[PDB]
């Protein structure tokens, strides 16, 4: 039995053994929440902007949950960057900064959660297996905070103390682990451009691109946390992501309906 030989390797070898690794790779693949979509609501790009950005997006979430299962994660934003600057100036390590940034994404989940409470949509911990709300047509959505749980065990970047895995990575890994069908990043620009559209006056819009092409074009750290692009190339379930402008009325609704608004980034 390949099942038998896998268990022999699992008992007799180190988990570093390539033969064991290869046998585990042949295991079946169960998707835990295959019909859900994970959405990240940007901290700096959306929630920090207040009612003019958040209220229309609340309306879209309420309308969209009628036909789409939603896992809605929150970014952190300007208060996290303030905390990072204080802590970095004290010489504190990335693992300590990681814990501080989590509190800010938590704040944002709380505020969004209180606007959605009367619509039945709760705030849950990380929330993959918040199985009851995502199975009820009256609810069909949850809100969670987007920071990964690594905290003091955050792996640092090659340089600096800014945690490299933030809300983009936290939301993406949730979609990947639960085998969700779709991952949508909600930011404040129409999508990926050839340069930062805020600081370059003739950047060109990019509707569709691969991770390798992004790296080759020199924009590995552009609209998404650059570790997300590497996680995307390793993913088993979520092999592409879409980035859309949450400041455009109805943009999230149209993305959920399958319209190619924004930029689609593919693993290959």
């Amino acid at each position: 039995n390949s099942t038998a030989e896998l268990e022999e390797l699992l008992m007799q070898r180190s988990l570093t053994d390539p033969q064991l690794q290869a046998a585990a790779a042949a295991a079946a693949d169960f998707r835990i929440l295959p019909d859900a979509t994970v959405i990240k609501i940007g901290g700096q790009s959306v929630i920090d902007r207040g009612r003019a950005a958040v209220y229309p997006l609340v309306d879209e979430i309420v309308a969209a949950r009628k036909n789409h299962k939603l896992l809605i994660g929150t970014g952190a934003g300007t208060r996290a960057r303030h905390l990072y600057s204080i802590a970095a100036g004290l010489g504190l390590p990335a693992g300590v900064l990681a814990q501080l940034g989590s509190s800010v994404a938590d704040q944002n989940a709380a505020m969004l959660g209180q606007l959605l409470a009367k619509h039945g949509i709760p705030v849950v911990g990380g929330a993959g297996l918040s199985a009851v709300p995502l199975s009820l047509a009256e609810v069909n959505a949850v809100v969670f905070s987007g920071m990964p749980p690594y905290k003091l065990w955050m792996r640092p970047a090659a340089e600096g103390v800014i945690p490299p895995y933030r809300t983009d990575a936290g939301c993406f890994l949730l979609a990947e682990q639960f085998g969700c069908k779709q991952m949508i990043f909600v930011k404040d620009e129409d999508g990926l451009y050839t340069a930062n559209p805020k600081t370059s006056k003739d950047a060109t819009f990019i509707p569709r691109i691969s991770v390798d092409e992004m790296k080759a074009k020199g924009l590995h750290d552009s609209i998404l946390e650059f570790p997300v692009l590497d996680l995307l190339q390793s993913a088993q379930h979520v092999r592409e992501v879409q980035v859309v402008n949450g400041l455009v009325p109805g943009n999230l609704t149209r993305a959920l309906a399958g319209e190619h608004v924004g930029t689609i980034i593919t693993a290959s």
Partner: protein, 246 residues
């Protein structure tokens, strides 16, 4: 190198392999008596790995088709059980098991209250484990190093059921070919293919380490080797992390 401060520079971190614990009283009792004698000498954070019971839950979880983020907390549970077992044997000395949140933000006060604490070496990646392999990559060795380096600890010592790192599995098919490595660098190990007694992810986090310059893997089945390693004596395999001394 304009590196971050050391939070707990006086701390010594010891990682006990889960397969050492798997050997039961025959291995645990001498290890407990060696740890008892070390308590007045060092301020110890003792972290336990998972061992064979995690292999069984991997066997069931892989049979059920579960993803790598599902397997990670299932394995972490076995490391915490090993920690509860070890701490129970040291309770009469004032040692208790402490949870990840206590380790992360309240280790200082607890090591002020007592000479050593026991915790789990698995890091809380859980369902945010990285994809790629179906086996969770960030295991006990990796979590113990991430903690030790984040704290700026004086050292990390890895307590194994073999003498150290060999050029092949010394208990495997190519065992008459396996040659002992007294010293190595993390970069040299990472560019090799083949099994190791430590996580391959340990080598990756050593590449970005800020403080820990060397990690020694020693045989915890030989009494005295952990004691010697905590004094800087070379009784196992030294892994150079690539952090340079000032």
């Amino acid at each position: 190198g304009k590196r971050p401060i050391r939070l707990l520079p006086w701390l010594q971190v010891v990682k006990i392999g889960g397969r050492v614990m798997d050997r039961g009283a025959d291995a645990i009792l001498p290890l407990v008596e060696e740890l008892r004698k070390l308590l007045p000498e060092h301020r110890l954070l003792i972290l336990t790995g998972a061992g064979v019971r995690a292999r069984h839950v991997f066997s069931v979880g892989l049979d059920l088709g579960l993803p790598v983020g599902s397997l990670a907390p299932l394995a972490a549970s076995e490391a915490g059980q090993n920690g509860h077992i070890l701490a129970a044997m040291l309770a009469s000395e004032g040692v208790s098991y402490v949870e990840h949140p206590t380790v992360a933000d309240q280790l200082a006060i607890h090591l002020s209250a007592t000479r050593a604490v026991v915790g789990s070496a698995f890091p809380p990646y859980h369902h945010h484990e990285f994809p790629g392999s179906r086996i969770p990559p960030h295991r006990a060795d990796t979590g113990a190093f991430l903690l030790a380096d984040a704290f700026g600890a004086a050292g990390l010592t890895i307590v194994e059921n073999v003498d150290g790192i060999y050029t092949a599995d010394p208990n495997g098919p190519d065992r008459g070919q396996a040659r002992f490595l007294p010293e190595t660098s993390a970069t040299d190990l990472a560019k090799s293919e083949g099994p190791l007694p430590v996580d391959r992810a340990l080598l990756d986090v050593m590449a970005t380490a800020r403080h820990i310059e060397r990690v020694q893997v020693v045989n915890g089945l030989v009494p005295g080797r952990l004691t010697a390693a905590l004094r800087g004596e070379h009784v196992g395999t030294l892994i150079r992390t690539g952090v340079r001394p000032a």
